[PDB]
Amino acid sequence: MRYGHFDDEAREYVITTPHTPYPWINYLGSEQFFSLLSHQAGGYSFYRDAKMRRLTRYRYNNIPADAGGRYLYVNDGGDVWTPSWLPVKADLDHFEARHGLGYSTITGERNGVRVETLFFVPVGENAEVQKVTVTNTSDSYKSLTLFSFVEFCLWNAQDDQTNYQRNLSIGEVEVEQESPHGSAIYHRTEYRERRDHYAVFAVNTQAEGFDTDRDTFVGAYNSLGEAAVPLKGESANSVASGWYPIGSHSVAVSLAPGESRELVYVLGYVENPDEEKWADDAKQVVNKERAHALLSRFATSEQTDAAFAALKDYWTDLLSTYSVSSNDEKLDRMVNIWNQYQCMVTFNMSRSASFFETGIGRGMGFRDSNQDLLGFVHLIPERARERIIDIASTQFADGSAYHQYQPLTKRGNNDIGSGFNDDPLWLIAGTAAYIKETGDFSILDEPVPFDNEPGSEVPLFEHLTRSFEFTVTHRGPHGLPLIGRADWNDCLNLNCFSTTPGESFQTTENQAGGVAESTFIAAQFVLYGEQYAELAARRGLADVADRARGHVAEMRDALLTDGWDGSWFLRAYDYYGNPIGTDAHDEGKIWIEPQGFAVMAGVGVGEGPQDTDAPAIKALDSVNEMLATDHGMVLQYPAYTTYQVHMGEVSTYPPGYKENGGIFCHNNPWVIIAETVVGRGGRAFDYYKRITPAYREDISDVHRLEPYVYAQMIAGKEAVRHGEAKNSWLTGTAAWNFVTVSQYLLGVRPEYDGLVVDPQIGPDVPSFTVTRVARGATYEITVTNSGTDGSRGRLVVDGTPVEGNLVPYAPAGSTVRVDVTL
Amino acid sequence: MRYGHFDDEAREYVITTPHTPYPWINYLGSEQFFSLLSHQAGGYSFYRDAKMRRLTRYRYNNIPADAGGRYLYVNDGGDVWTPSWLPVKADLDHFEARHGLGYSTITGERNGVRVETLFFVPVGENAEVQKVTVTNTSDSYKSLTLFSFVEFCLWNAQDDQTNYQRNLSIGEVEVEQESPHGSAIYHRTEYRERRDHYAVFAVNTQAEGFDTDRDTFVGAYNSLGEAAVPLKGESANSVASGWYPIGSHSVAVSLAPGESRELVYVLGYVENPDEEKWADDAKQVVNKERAHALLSRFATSEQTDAAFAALKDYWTDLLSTYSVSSNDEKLDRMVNIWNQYQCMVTFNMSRSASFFETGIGRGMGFRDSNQDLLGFVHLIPERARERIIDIASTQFADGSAYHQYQPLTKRGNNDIGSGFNDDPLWLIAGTAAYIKETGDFSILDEPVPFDNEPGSEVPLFEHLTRSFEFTVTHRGPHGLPLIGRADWNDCLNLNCFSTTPGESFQTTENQAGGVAESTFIAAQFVLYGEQYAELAARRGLADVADRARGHVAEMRDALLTDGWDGSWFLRAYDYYGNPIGTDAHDEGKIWIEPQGFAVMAGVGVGEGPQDTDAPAIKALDSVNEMLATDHGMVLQYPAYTTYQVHMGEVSTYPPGYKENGGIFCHNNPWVIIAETVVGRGGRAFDYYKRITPAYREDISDVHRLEPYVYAQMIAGKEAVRHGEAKNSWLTGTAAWNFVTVSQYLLGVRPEYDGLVVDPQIGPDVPSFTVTRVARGATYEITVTNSGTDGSRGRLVVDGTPVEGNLVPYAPAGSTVRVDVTL
């Protein structure tokens, strides 16, 4: 069953019941200011840093989940309710929430009163803005008191929740009932201290009253759903002095039948230059100039409406780079709208804040930066370019890099340090793609430091060389790369050997040496080894290139021998050299990562889909028989039922969950592409459909999480909860699925010397057109598709039949028409 | 107004309403296993380590506060309620909660049904046990279904609340409906991996049904107060697979009028040897032997009742060391019962967990270990002795020590390291007191390592020498000890100079050198310098002693000159040698720490209370005019109204809170004693009364926190919330107040060569007897007291008038009678 439906025209998902299987959130804000917003108005806002600069408080593991948010308590003749349904849970005659691009509306009607709220963060604005519309839809008169509600976080969220001995005493506000454009509350905790910023909560009309103390507003022994002030019908005008500060105003609205009222609220993040902090000599009153300026900017519905439409323009113009038209409206909505939206969010948010990720840790995987870039680089190339240079500057001079990178500080994480031997090659993956997309080889010439050390700068290409050579000099007895702490799979820790709860599986190493090898880094070395060879060759470094090709060929040999178990690739070699991922064993006979990434790199690919002796085909057939379920392909099988001390975290998970038999979506697109590579488009589109939001909307009660975005993890076949997802939104599944549907199924992928036009999607999408803007030009690609295994497209270019699958990059401002037949 | 009353004969505080100003908790367990228990049954349990080994989940900053705990949902013919009132909040005909020593009872009656629950942790047991008694007090028949409720924490509480990406997938249970003695649930999260321990939740009767999944028991979009299973009237028999695991059973009870039912529940922490973890070969089923054994131990009311009484015996026998009988029952109840109880708790719990301290950080201040010891050393000398040796082993070879000590690991905290130059002398304060109490000078001969380094062991006395000499070699231009990062006052950071939110005020040092001095360490050096001199001299090290006396005399000189502002002592010298705590300034003219500790050490004490030119009297008169309020003495005055970058954290607090103008109770007993020293007992007893639980019970609505225990912080005169407390229970206020009332007001303090009998309490306690057991002997001390300033007691010993105030230590098993006249 479903709990809403897609509104393609509006570019929205519309949730028609407050009773979802789990809270479904949206992301607001696209620059420095962000918001988490559920269909019930829960979650929070933060500027830049979701740990140190969080404006509002949100409790993970609340009972019930999503119990606090931005609330507008309606008091209608004594009866108190909220349009978000929660916290109050009053019977609503109508409820609807619409999640769109950088905004959401929530609407509730009860007893002849309808409240619509537009939530969004404006462009060029560090503020969450609420446009409220109250409509008397009854035949009688209405006289209402509306109580707005926000609960503040004391900025640093880790502290706010763990350091009560200090922080129950530092809460401070200022109250400005007669604000230039209405009424406003200032949460200024620690502005007295080292903070040069405060928060503002305001409404563009004169408030009847207010409240900044949470215990006075809500009452003792009261849940948000029973708050005392709204039931009383009148604000308590509480002034906070420590404890829990809130933003709250009462607004009086009288309405004839059919008559409506519009109100605008702003949640703002205001900073001041250090010298400009105080309005007064005594340094007690905050300087509110900038806060008034922001509030002058949203004093009217007309202003607000314009900021909104502008936001709509931003996103409208942003998503013009790639779109498709098909028989299949689910594919269309994913390719054009929801998958691209999700990829921008992963860029803007990294892995900081989610209903699952708790926003306390500020870091993000070096490997995750790089994979994420592949999904948004067609949208924001100049930004992408700047990202590639940021992360590459933290790279150690020996080729390794920090396993985690801080986007806010643009520095590697020292505490975690290095050691994950797949991390380095990921920088090549990022560079190569960025350049194929833009043709900006100039970046390779850009100066980049090692470990952010001034005067150590070398051309970026030399960094790729460090990354390439790192694997060459760190191989094991079989010639496969040493795994180090882990490869892509963080829970594969072969140098951990831990028996002590609370030691870090990824960092702690209880045995010093060993020979642990990974087939996945091997496959990655062949794949991104050849991309590096391509870049060195074009660069004019022919000697370096042929030589790197030489290593790549060596790794290709190793995989197909020491890396091959007979019907699929081994996953790794352990500390003592015994194989991992072999049919000889009982559990973890087969792992998905090396099967997909290795065939992604042509290793084992024979003559065709018919070449069933081709290892790549044996592997892919093994992946189908042993790992693929209706819900996606599981990570390995069988899952580990007892703890394997030699293998780190992977076996600490119960069968069917996460890295132990979970369906890790991130790595499924690897098999999908591998399937287009070997020439089985139908099987590739099948797999892609099994894990894609649009196609899972029907089984929402199983999925639980948002039907519009990818989640990291869907419980595998050995979990009772199979089909159930966790960890939605922030995941490399987005980037890799976009790259899969856009470049391999649809078949439109940038190359250095032109645009490949190679569709591989199977019979289920017989016809489609792709519109893409590449190098200033627009290509219109009209595909007629039998979808037959091993059929590749013939291009007709601008009315003239051509040979091969590459289309030459036309000049900027050009329109090229490409006819493809499969 | 009050919310209960003291029950002295039961040794309990009884809270007669569920509607306290704030949740009032108790501590259960006295060995390895502890529980936090509010008057509403909220809080949690943990074994040893409140961070890594926490059995049950508790949310700080819940709305409303205290919303989850151990709940027994009563379903009486459809009407669902709880005896703890919360979560459900059903109208109760009767409610009462009684907090006693290591146990509590909670009782609720609604519609002819009464449920009494005895909560306690048994001696020699790692388990919280609940004795439930259901009594049909109506004239009609009753048929009830009781639903027990516990919500598990996934052991590591920091992880459990921040690592959802991993931990929403690792929740596991086992359900045993037919347990040897009833029904039991096993929470075994991560037992699959590195944990050798699980938890058990059971009832000594056959359960009708069960539930281990929180979302099924409580329901979607439901608060604990609305849980779905109890409303339904029947358990859902949920099996937890990830998400949130709970312990819950339904029990069917039918009752004729007047007839009652008794049920026993156990919350248990069961470990297994590594080789004994599994009942099965497949290693899937937990070995429940030890869990069954524990449950066999509490299968009956008779067993339970005996464990209870034994617990009562433990505490009855434990608090036999010191008691007083007086006209004043509040003094009596504090001296005999509540103050002594609180001191044991600080020992057992350190600073790990309370409703204000969040149990995530495992550490405790080195200085706090030492001061705490002074309050419980008469109770548990052998343990104390072991503590003194534990902390002293982490001390660096140069005299400094870790500022924080881990009691569980018996290791100094490395991350925080050293630098707080008052910390070292605190080890002398601990040793000297322990030895005066016991006469065990043998400890001074004990081998102790520096920084836990094998082979570095030196006699303990040498450690005291390191501590003594550390101050001698770390003095400033005026001859006062360099403050380092801070002295006792952690928020006095003179080498911080920070302007960056999130830098640690106590550790980060933005300026390398300076000359910051502290008068408080100076006073501490004179006080504990002379104790050290006494110990070296007795030890036979005459040269070392006279020499240390020499330094002590030098420090005395410095304080009364470079340390004296005219009418009180300066607080310190800053980084650039400018005074802090001087009448020349506008804010922080006077600080309390150096006034009390310095006169505690006789610095400035003249001829008598009449000697008004004596600096000690000027200082103490200054403390009275400028710092003392009806609620206690404030920390400094006036409080800082703007941030002082040169002074660290102290000024980040708003006036009247914590270290900036808050009433820090810990340091008030310093002035109180200093007042008995100068000979003003009435003023000393006045001050003591202003901050003591028994005497504040009347103004509970102001205090807010528990009226039976000391809190760390009462808002000072410049806070609007003046009179309001925070941070109850875990504080050095307990130790120091006990030492104040027991040794200085009442006047009974151990010395090396005998027992001083020197009362100084003022007119308000005209007569009292003290019963003290010291060195195996019992002293009965009968005081007749005019309470006149400057009157000190004349001892008559065993019928014979004697001279001076010292009574010779009689042999073990003796009874000495001491008559005192004042």
Ligand SMILES: OC[C@H]1O[C@@H](O)[C@H](O)[C@@H](O)[C@@H]1O
């Ligand atoms: O780190 C512990 C310290 O935190 C500071 O913020 C508090 O003001 C102080 O009372 C406490 O000792």
Ligand SMILES: OC[C@H]1O[C@@H](O)[C@H](O)[C@@H](O)[C@@H]1O
């Ligand atoms: O464990 C597999 C993957 O897990 C993800 O949670 C991490 O972000 C990613 O870096 C890793 O490759």
Ligand SMILES: OC[C@H]1O[C@@H](O)[C@H](O)[C@@H](O)[C@@H]1O
């Ligand atoms: O450190 C982040 C990692 O945490 C592990 O517990 C998870 O299994 C893995 O998916 C994730 O990448």
Ligand SMILES: OC[C@H]1O[C@@H](O)[C@H](O)[C@@H](O)[C@@H]1O
């Ligand atoms: O800050 C003053 C006091 O604060 C307490 O929290 C610290 O534990 C104690 O060491 C210090 O003396």
